Amino acid sequence: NDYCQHFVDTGHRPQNFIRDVRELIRLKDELIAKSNTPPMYLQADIEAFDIRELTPKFDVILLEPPLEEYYRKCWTWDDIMKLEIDEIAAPRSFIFLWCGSGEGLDLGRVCLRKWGYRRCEDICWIKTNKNNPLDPKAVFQRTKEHCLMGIKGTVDIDLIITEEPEIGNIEKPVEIFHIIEHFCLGRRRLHLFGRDSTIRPGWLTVGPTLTNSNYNAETYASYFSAPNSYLTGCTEEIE
Amino acid sequence: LFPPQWICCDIRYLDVSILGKFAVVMADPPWDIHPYGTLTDDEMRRLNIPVLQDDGFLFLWVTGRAMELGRECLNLWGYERVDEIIWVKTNQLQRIIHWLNHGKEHCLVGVKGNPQGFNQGLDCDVIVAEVRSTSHKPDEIYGMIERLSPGTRKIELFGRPHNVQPNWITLGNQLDGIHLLDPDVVARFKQRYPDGIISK
Numbered sequence A: 001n002d003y004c005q006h007f008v009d010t011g012h013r014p015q016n017f018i019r020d021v022r023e024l025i026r027l028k029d030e031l032i033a034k035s036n037t038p039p040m041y042l043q044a045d046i047e048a049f050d051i052r053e054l055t056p057k058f059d060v061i062l063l064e065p066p067l068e069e070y071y072r073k074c075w076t077w078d079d080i081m082k083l084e085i086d087e088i089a090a091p092r093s094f095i096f097l098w099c100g101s102g103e104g105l106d107l108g109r110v111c112l113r114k115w116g117y118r119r120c121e122d123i124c125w126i127k128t129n130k131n132n133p134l135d136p137k138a139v140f141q142r143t144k145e146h147c148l149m150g151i152k153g154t155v156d157i158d159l160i161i162t163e164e165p166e167i168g169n170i171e172k173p174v175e176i177f178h179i180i181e182h183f184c185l186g187r188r189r190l191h192l193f194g195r196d197s198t199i200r201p202g203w204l205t206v207g208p209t210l211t212n213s214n215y216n217a218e219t220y221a222s223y224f225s226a227p228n229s230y231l232t233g234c235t236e237e238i239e
Numbered sequence B: 001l002f003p004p005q006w007i008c009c010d011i012r013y014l015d016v017s018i019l020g021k022f023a024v025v026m027a028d029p030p031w032d033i034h035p036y037g038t039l040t041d042d043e044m045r046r047l048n049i050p051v052l053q054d055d056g057f058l059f060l061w062v063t064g065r066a067m068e069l070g071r072e073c074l075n076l077w078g079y080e081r082v083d084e085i086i087w088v089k090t091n092q093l094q095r096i097i098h099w100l101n102h103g104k105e106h107c108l109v110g111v112k113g114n115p116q117g118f119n120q121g122l123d124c125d126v127i128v129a130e131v132r133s134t135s136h137k138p139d140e141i142y143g144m145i146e147r148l149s150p151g152t153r154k155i156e157l158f159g160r161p162h163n164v165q166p167n168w169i170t171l172g173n174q175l176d177g178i179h180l181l182d183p184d185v186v187a188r189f190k191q192r193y194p195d196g197i198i199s200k
């Protein structure tokens, strides 16, 4: 049966009909939770903020700038591409960049290359409209957002399926955190443009709308001092 | 001309100027990603895609590094990427089939010129559909393209015999011979290729 035809007929998106979205994996989740640094967070206007102050250099950066298309301060790709991300990324490190569904899919690739990464995955957040069955250049109704994964230096699927959030809700699916943490990429994890509602153990959140801060550069670095410098975030703590 | 048409050929060498202009182009190229005969990056850049349309849409399947190279060709050939379709691959029970497992295939959507009279916005950019033989795109894409631009002329590059469709001219080197019905195309084909051979 043709779900594209069904959507034009009824308004129910094709992804509404995907179902069901070795034994346990939970021990891995347990090891992740054990090695998680305390949550740390800092209110900072990132336009004006000298990002160099964020140390040490990060193993993972999750970058979630507030694009104009998420509505109806917004950040243009002009703004984002001028961020000096390569100054705070570790020589081997990873980036997850929320690119939206428009020109961000192109300009975000330019950013990744600007900061020294190559794209190795395209993670698609597909939004169902089970509960509620328009860019001028758009050819199609846009029902998904892309999060690009980049690498620099030397169990999960690449789809996230959730219901489309209410209008004006900009949150991204918390599942992106699970995908990232299951990669076991190291423990210095930065989330730029996070919010009070996204603060999470194992992560440093930095964004303009945070209401409180507890970031201390020296305290933060002490979580990764020897013998804890190279842990993947997926192994036992060091006794 | 409404019924299916095709040309077995090496798309590198066919003079595609005999084919006229098309409202929609679709291509599923044999990108040189690291099974079949491949095309170098330069060969893809050099494909004479620009003569095929004046105002319309290009559908460009991509995977791996061709997600980037496909964007380069798309722009070189004179298009702006305005959409990106994903096909979520399921089984018959509607369940999903490097660093992550791959649940989907990507089709870039480019626009050239200013297409008028298309039905933009009728379909959405996610296709959910059952997988078949390796290397087959889902048939839903032809329905989406028909609704977008009903009755117009369309051309597929690097298609196979199962891809021949009404309103479409299919090119690929595994098609059975040459089967043309449109008189202007039949005429220009005879001039350019009087002994029916397509070399160099």
Ligand SMILES: CNc1cc(N2CCC[C@@](O)(CNC(=O)c3ccc(CN4CC5(CCC5)[C@@H]4C4CC4)cc3O)C2)ncn1
Pocket: B009, B010, B011, B012, B028, B029, B030, B036, B037, B038, B039, B061, B062, B063, B105, B106, B134, B135, B136, B137, B138, B158, B159, B160, B171, B172, B173, B174, B175
């Ligand atoms: C030298 N000059 C030529 C060559 C030529 N060839 C070469 C031999 C084969 C063929 O004859 C017919 N095509 C294919 O076997 C074929 C198979 C698989 C793919 C990968 N696609 C399949 C998908 C899944 C959804 C669409 C993926 C996509 C990337 C995300 C692409 C293909 O194109 C074309 N034709 C004319 N001149």
